[PDB]
Symmetry: C2
Subunit: 200 residues, 2 copies
């Protein structure tokens, strides 16, 4: 499996390197040559790893859902809720600058020359994760922690917050909160986990 | 006297009439001529009370803040919290399409070199309202309701939600949330009043 493991290493750095390159400067402002030079493998191996620039885009967005999927222990026997729900909220807001980037890339790629094999593969896992989210809510309404209301009361709520906070970390002058301020983050985590919780 | 009250009818009604027209039709798709006929008076009549269409915009946004100002009963000594905290959120989300209308209207022409005589009054009234909000936040940490963290931790949360919900009340598929479910509102109300509260 040795020829395999160094393939995955080379491929991963190119993915980690590239993400900084889009997040730094600009999403459109990078090319394979910049990513090739940032890793220094001379624009030929990266070609073998990923055929096009757009392929890296979705491979990032695919892997983003793979980790959110991996966060969901996916086997729903007992296990601790809330804490997984916290791991959810921590995950959604961990890189608000990355969040808005991925929205741009889906709006970019899907309309313009989408490589649909990964786009159509993507929506499947996104809809698969959505199911696991609504499932996570139902188990939490069953225990009695969360309030007994339709699960789209909640999944829309958990969506409205995460959409607003990322809009906070972005639109105005709140560059104070964006960097450091781990007491707003863990405060914001407690906001989501305690959102809709029942009080007698 | 009797001579006074009839000024207020035209101004109030035409503004109340007009506000509905933008939300139904479009903010830019309407003109004073339609608004003159929507209540059925001469355009010349509207002209004396209100100068141009673009100026009509801010008088709504001013009155929206004028009512929010009146809501914070700094006149009153007692000062009932929580219900005022709900009255805040109830006020902010009662017309989420109007919030985006005012947000969109600010994004539109009024921001760029149009009737600034009215524009700076808004910032003054908005910044004055901001004071009463952060004041209400601090007073509620005094009682022990909110968690003891810097008082704009909460104003940032309460802003991120209200920005997300308005984006939800605007989300593509949610035509039910506005009129079918009145129980989603009271769900968010219990969410807002109980947002950031301290535990044992």
């Amino acid at each position: 499996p040795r020829k395999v493991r160094e393939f995955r290493r080379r491929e991963q750095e190119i993915l980690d390197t590239a993400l900084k390159l889009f997040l730094e400067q600009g999403e459109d402002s990078v090319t394979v040559e910049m990513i090739a030079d940032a890793v220094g493998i001379g624009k030929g191996t990266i070609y073998k790893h990923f055929k096009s620039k757009a392929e890296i885009y979705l491979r990032l967005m695919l892997d983003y859902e793979r980790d959110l999927a991996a966060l969901f222990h996916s086997e729903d026997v007992a296990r601790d809720k809330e804490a997984l729900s916290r791991a959810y909220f921590e995950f959604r807001m961990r890189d608000p600058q990355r969040y808005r980037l991925f929205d741009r890339l889906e709006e970019k790629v899907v309309k313009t020359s989408q490589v649909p094999e990964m786009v159509e593969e993507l929506h499947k896992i996104r809809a698969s994760n959505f199911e696991r989210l609504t499932q996570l809510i139902k188990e939490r309404i069953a225990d009695g922690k969360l309030e007994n209301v339709p699960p789209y009361f909640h999944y829309c709520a958990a969506w409205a917050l995460v959409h607003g906070a990322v809009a906070l970390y972005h639109s105005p002058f709140w560059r104070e909160v964006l960097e450091d301020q781990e007491g707003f983050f863990h405060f914001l985590m407690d906001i989501g986990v305690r959102m809709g919780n029942k009080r007698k």
